[PDB]
Amino acid sequence: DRVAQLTIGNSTITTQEAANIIVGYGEWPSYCSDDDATAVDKPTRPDVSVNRFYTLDTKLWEKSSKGWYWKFPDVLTETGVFGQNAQFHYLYRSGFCIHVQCNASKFHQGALLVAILPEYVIGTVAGGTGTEDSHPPYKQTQPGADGFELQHPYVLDAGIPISQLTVCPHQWINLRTNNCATIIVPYMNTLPFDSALNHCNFGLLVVPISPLDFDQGATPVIPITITLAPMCSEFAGLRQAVTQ
């Protein structure tokens, strides 16, 4: 139960210090029913070429880090064959298998909260005073694969408490216990299909709740890598490639 292997497509992930697997809302990704669908054109289900593990950028965990987030359909729109299909097709649909990995040693300590927040809408500080109706820039609402850093993690940059973020599919990475978190997310939206460009079904939040710490001499560079794989990907409404 502490060891596990995730194989999908032509990619395999290994781990010897896992903490089980979470299946968001107790549901596995699935394809769209014939009665839940509307688009009449036959969709493309590329399978193995898009349903595989993509490893996005690595972040560095510092004793003062606040946390980061990634919007999901988004992080992959410019990567591999998944990205190509997401650009050529109007409609997209899929679940995800998210595997956040971060290892240290038996002498390091700290705890990361890895959670999935559906429809993660970002807010602004409203000019500090709260009298200015400002809005988050495109660079912040859809940060891409590089993710974005939280400025006010306590309120998740959206006026909501992070202490309650656990009502969402989550898992923790407690260095003294495990070195990775695995969460499987089904397609969640009020529509059977939607644009992979304009809409971000959910956001991945990785936030240090218990600060990283260690004594001088132990390796100081502790990376946090994000690996994710689409599941049951379906695309429809073919046309030319659109970036945004």
Binding site: W28, P118, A126, G128, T129, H135, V155, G159, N174, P186
Partner: protein, 296 residues
């Protein structure tokens, strides 16, 4: 005749594999007798929060319990019990003199996000599907009931919004309208679930249109048309100025409610309607604070 990986393929399975099942729970669970347990191997108290699952430890395994036949109902915490209570969601002013609807008519953009109480409750969930019951309480700014005839009209998106008290749009040949006197009891009406989506979204993490998303258009981020149900228009049924100043309070009661994906409850004060902005200089804690962690 056909390639094996295609026969044994599972691409196409439309049924969602559910790991959990909804069981009957009309009352709180009972407590069963428990005795001392001095043994190795079994540790109910020890958990691993890293897994992401709440502790499954029960009272019985932590202390010696008696038998309690719990018959406390769980009915008042259903979604309908919680949401089926009318609350203020709109307020329209029709003054005699001023700069706010002084021509005897008003157009209220249907949005229940203008009042904190009602808004905070619904924002506990991401998606919600429901029918509703709207009640319109009208009177003067002093609460005085006056003999005046009003006309409320629901203008779905695309229909012509009235530009004056004598607008031709008030013919309501197709739009639903209600004619009431302020002396009659508040008008009440039933509304269905009219979104083109399968549910309303209190949160839409995306943009409504394609193209470049420049600074000037960031106004559209988080704006979902599937939630924009149209306009609510009011007027003095006449061709001359009304003799009294009016106010119309709109109350909404949800019925036949379905809700999905719970979220953290609003932590900071609300500032605007179309977004979750908060005052960055006044970020207050979720709750009360104290002097020391070792003292009450």
């Amino acid at each position: 005749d056909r390639v094996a990986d295609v026969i044994e393929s599972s691409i196409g399975d439309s049924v969602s594999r559910a790991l959990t099942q909804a069981l009957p729970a009309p009352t709180g669970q009972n407590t069963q007798v428990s005795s001392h347990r001095l043994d190795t191997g079994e540790v109910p108290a020890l958990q691993a929060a890293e897994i992401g699952a709440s502790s499954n430890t029960s009272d019985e395994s932590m202390i010696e319990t008696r038998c309690v036949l719990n018959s406390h109902s769980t009915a008042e915490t259903t979604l309908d019990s919680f949401f089926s209570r009318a609350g203020l969601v709109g307020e329209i002013d029709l003054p005699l003199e001023g700069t706010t609807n002084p021509n005897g008519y008003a157009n209220w953009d249907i949005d229940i996000t203008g009042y904190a109480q009602m808004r905070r409750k619904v924002e506990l969930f991401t998606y919600m599907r429901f029918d509703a019951e709207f009640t319109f309480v009208a009177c003067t700014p002093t609460g005085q009931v006056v003999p005046q005839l009003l006309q409320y009209m629901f203008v779905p998106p695309g229909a012509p919004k009235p530009e004056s008290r004598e607008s031709l749009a008030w013919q309501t040949a197709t739009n639903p309208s209600v004619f009431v006197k302020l002396t009659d009891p508040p008008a009440q009406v039933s509304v269905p679930f009219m979104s083109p989506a399968s549910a309303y979204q209190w949160f839409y993490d995306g943009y409504p249109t394609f193209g470049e998303h420049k600074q000037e258009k960031d106004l559209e981020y988080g704006a979902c048309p599937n939630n924009m149900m149209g306009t609510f228009s009011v007027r003095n049924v006449g061709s001359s100025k009304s003799k009294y100043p009016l106010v119309v309070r709109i109350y909404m009661r949800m019925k036949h409610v379905r809700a999905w994906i719970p979220r953290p409850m609003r932590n900071q004060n609300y500032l605007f309607k179309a977004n979750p902005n908060y005052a960055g200089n006044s970020i207050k804690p979720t709750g009360t604070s104290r002097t020391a962690i070792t003292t009450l």
